[PDB]
Design a protein around this nucleic acid. Structure first.
Length: 49
DNA sequence: ACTGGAGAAAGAAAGTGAAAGGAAGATAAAACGGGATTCATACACCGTTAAATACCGGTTTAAAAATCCCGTGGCGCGTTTTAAAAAATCTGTGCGGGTGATTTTAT
């Protein structure tokens, strides 16, 4: 939902991961950031999904 | 003079950094043993023949087989030990979201 709100579509330029992690932590998820980054990493590995 | 608190000295017990050394590991040089070539040379297979050996008939005789009496130790039974193998029970560990923390360099 945060990535959708940021307008980070599939046919546009990439964005830094720190910005997305900061948005998620500051607006929706009241927890740590390293776990969020690790969760984001797993959803991009071709040998995991 | 006497009392009770407080600071300083002195003494004894515990923690400490450093210690040969030795069994317990670890790592290289060496001696070994097991395949691919390369032939010359000794070995395998085929005709010929004198000679050495197998075989039959009948003795025999000395040696080995058969038989009887007995007196033992070597197997057999019952009951314990004792390792050896098997079944049962514990110990780690990694997968993914969460909580909280550490270190070294340049100017």
């Amino acid at each position: 939902y945060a990535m959708n709100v940021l307008g980070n579509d599939w046919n546009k330029a990439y964005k830094k991961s720190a910005r997305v992690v900061g948005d998620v932590i500051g607006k929706y998820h009241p927890h740590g950031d390293s776990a969020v980054y690790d969760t984001i990493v797993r959803m991009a590995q071709p040998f995991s999904l």
